[PDB]
Design a protein around this nucleic acid. Sequence first.
RNA 1: CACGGACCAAGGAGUCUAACGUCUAUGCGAGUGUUUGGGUGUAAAACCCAUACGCGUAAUGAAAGUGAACGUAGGUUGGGGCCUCGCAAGAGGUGCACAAUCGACCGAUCCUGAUGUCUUCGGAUGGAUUUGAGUAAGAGCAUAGCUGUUGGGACCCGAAAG
Lengths: 148, 37, 185, 52, 51, 52
Amino acid sequence: PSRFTKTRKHRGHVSAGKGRIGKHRKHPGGRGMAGGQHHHRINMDKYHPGYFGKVGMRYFHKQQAHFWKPVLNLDKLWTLIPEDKRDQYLKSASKETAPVIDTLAAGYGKILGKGRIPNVPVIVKARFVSKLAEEKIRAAGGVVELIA
Amino acid sequence: ATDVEARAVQDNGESAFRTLRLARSEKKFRGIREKRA
Amino acid sequence: GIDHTSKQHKRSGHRTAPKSDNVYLKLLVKLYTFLARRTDAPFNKVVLKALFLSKINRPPVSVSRIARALKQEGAANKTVVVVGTVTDDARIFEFPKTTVAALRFTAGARAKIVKAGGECITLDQLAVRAPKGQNTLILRGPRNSREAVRHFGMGPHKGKAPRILSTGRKFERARGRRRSKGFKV
Amino acid sequence: QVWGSETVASSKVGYTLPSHIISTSDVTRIINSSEIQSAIRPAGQATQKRTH
Amino acid sequence: SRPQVTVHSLTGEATANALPLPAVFSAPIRPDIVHTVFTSVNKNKRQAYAV
Amino acid sequence: NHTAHNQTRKAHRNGIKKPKTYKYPSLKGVDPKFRRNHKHALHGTAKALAAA
RNA sequence: CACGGACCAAGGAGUCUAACGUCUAUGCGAGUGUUUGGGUGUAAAACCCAUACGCGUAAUGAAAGUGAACGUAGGUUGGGGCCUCGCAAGAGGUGCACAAUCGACCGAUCCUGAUGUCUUCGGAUGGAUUUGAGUAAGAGCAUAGCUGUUGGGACCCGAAAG
């Protein structure tokens, strides 16, 4: 749609919305992120502060597969179970048998602590765990089985 | 497959977080401690 | 001539009809205009002025927000009114029986509310069961919970985020963000 | 069996037909209902006279 | 409660066997997006042009 | 070279806005020795009203 | 008594794209995105689709690394609306959003340094005019549209030069 743009409403009006005194000239201000510490300094120091400098040290050859630790909290743990069975694990589990949850197959590498859970024993298999998130599981009745 | 869906619980006396927190440390301090001997 | 105090011919900065073209929203507007004109209630007016809203000012209200609302002293058997969308929340495990009235339910939000004996209602049945605004509890979602408000008022010492795409230790953490490199701001 | 219904699900995966936003399309049946007309005020003068 | 629609023949005659209306036909009829969709789907069979 | 002609007008168009005081203002600049004790006092009052 | 313009016709100048901001419409909604690709086809269309991937659901730190409920997810002030009483005025209760404020929680910095301990490992506990693009019953993903931004021949024509 060009019939909806303001280039159409400016047919007739010389100085098509870019002015008469100061016009639409050809790159005034430099090309780019230029003048970042000369004449655009008090934008780059207001709206983008932290530009202009080195921090921290270099990691040559980062593979972002080592640093695969997706988090899960104790709220979605019962979403990992399929909706059809967590019904009969919630109201049940007054029995001895306990549902087992493989977070690594869910796609997660760590479990965390945010939130609460029912007093329902689980078994939680994960390669990394937080202290509070083990404390809550043991408190419910469960256990944590580190893997890998 | 992996283990059986819906099996039993063996809450033994260990702490997983502490286990990891220690396995990290012994891996860190193996080489300095074997130099200690 | 006339010495003016006010800007002349100034529109009221409110909107008095939806920018949408959903005919099934035109109809509820036709309805609540009537029930706001030919009634002495403000619930109708509130609902009218809420139907006009944009998608950010008309946000989703979780089923847990509902369950917290019904936990109030005496609000436990009211009928609830959302003029937006009603989204599921799996973080809960116990939901009451109640009666919710809204435009759009998600399929999980419908199912929890229905599995708990409740029922999900549109804002046309609610005007039949509640014209003058009876036993109603209006809810609104959060507006400042957005990835866009996170940057508003961005400036020095305000504590707001920058508009930025790629994040790390190299991207806007060096000068103006610590005392060692330059200064902090 | 293609688009599905309340009873049988679609061949399409994860597809429910869209839910309505309003029940009935004839707003007048709603307006001229006893619950409403027993609760509104009385009307008058679609177009009214020129005083002064 | 679902209405019935009668099956006609090739000769024009209505048979007896009538059939329930599907649920598609009760679905919302929204011209806004039948149009918003058409203005984007009637563009898919295009051929480029240039100088 | 620094004419101030037409600045007051520009100010007064969108007006000179007073700062809109609130109740319960900020406590960033007060004596921390008083700040701590206030923090300990208010919890005690909360607790004392939790019973009565 | 500044510049262009003798007259006429036709042509003739803010565009397209990549990635983005705010705003609006829509679909679905803690998920979203069919279209790299495969099946299919009345054949560049339309129709169907797995697995991964992207963005998002968890931040913080230079980094190792750790990683979000004392509480009816807190209190106080206001707060629409709803309920109660009332002829009404008003009084009370409840009080989503939102704003101010004191706190609680996660990480970083400074401090305290327990049970135990390969005797130096470990770091519970309680703190601090410190600090964060944070938590606190999620809000986003995709498409489209005006405006706007950067790079691109980049509104059209134009150098001396290299």
